[PDB]
Design a protein around this nucleic acid. Sequence first.
DNA 1: TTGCATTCCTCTC
DNA 2: GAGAGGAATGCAA
Length: 91
Amino acid sequence: VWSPDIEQSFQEALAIYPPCGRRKIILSDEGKMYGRNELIARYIKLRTGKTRTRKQVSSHIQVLARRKAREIQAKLKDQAAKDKALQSMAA
DNA sequence: TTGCATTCCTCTC
DNA sequence: GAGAGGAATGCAA
């Protein structure tokens, strides 16, 4: 589903299409309405050839955000317990 | 526990 | 109403 090749081009898309600000929507000269994940999905097909839904992309963007949000706090908790012990014991 | 999908929300048009 | 991104849920493994 997120095979190394599809994953590669997805990582490529992330570098190609920078993250959006508050404005999430843009119109082409023909009037078709565009989002970042839609472009990302589009770029996948361009390089991979495979089909990845606009929503499949959004799901992936989410889980990567989840992970990094964990890895940072799991570090802020792995030491918060070591700090708590030394303090609770120093009492 | 979490990587997937799927709904819910709120924006532009 | 159409269609979008992103947060909320839903859901096996």
